[PDB]
Design a protein around this ligand. Structure first.
Ligand SMILES: NC1=CCC=NC1=O
Length: 165
């Protein structure tokens, strides 16, 4: 039935910032939503708890999910391999959209980004699979620690994460 909700508790240099929660569009992109959900609960033995947002570009997006190499070169899905672009039904319409980062067609792993603006040029290239439900203000606060080239000025971490309800 109803789409799952997951949360991230964000810290900045180890200090609590706040919680961001997401609605995952399992009704439209079930395989992609499931990967992110499971990575958020940690139920497979690995996932996002303790990982960082390693690339944040103000006015554009905050990117994370590289829990293996911590820098954009790693991550892994729950499927034992990278997975296909499920569909491109949903578009990058504005702030708060949750979408998969990738290195080309059919290469989804665990990396994802949260848009801070409408990023329509990514439509058909990145699978949109959720949106911020609560704590977009916390994403805005994280965005302030980014820079033009994406390097963050403080370490932005997922101190805790899980599924709500
Ligand atoms: N070009 C990009 C697309 C999505 C997330 N991060 C990027 O740097």
């Amino acid at each position: 039935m109803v789409n799952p909700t997951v949360f991230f508790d964000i810290a900045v240099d180890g200090e609590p910032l706040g919680r961001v929660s997401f609605e995952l569009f399992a009704d439209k992109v079930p395989k992609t939503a499931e990967n992110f959900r499971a990575l958020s609960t940690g139920e497979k033995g690995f996932g996002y708890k303790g990982s960082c947002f390693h690339r944040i570009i103000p006015g554009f997006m905050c990117q994370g999910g590289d829990f293996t190499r911590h820098n954009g070169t790693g991550g892994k899905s729950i499927y034992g391999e990278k997975f296909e672009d499920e569909n491109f039904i949903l578009k990058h319409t504005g702030p708060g959209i949750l979408s998969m980062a990738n290195a080309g067609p059919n290469t989804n792993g665990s990396q994802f980004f949260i848009c801070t603006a409408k990023t329509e040029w990514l439509d058909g290239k990145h699978v949109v699979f959720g949106k911020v439900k609560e704590g977009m203000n916390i994403v805005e606060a994280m965005e302030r620690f980014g820079s033009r080239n994406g390097k963050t000025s403080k370490k932005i971490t997922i101190a805790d994460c899980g599924q709500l309800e």
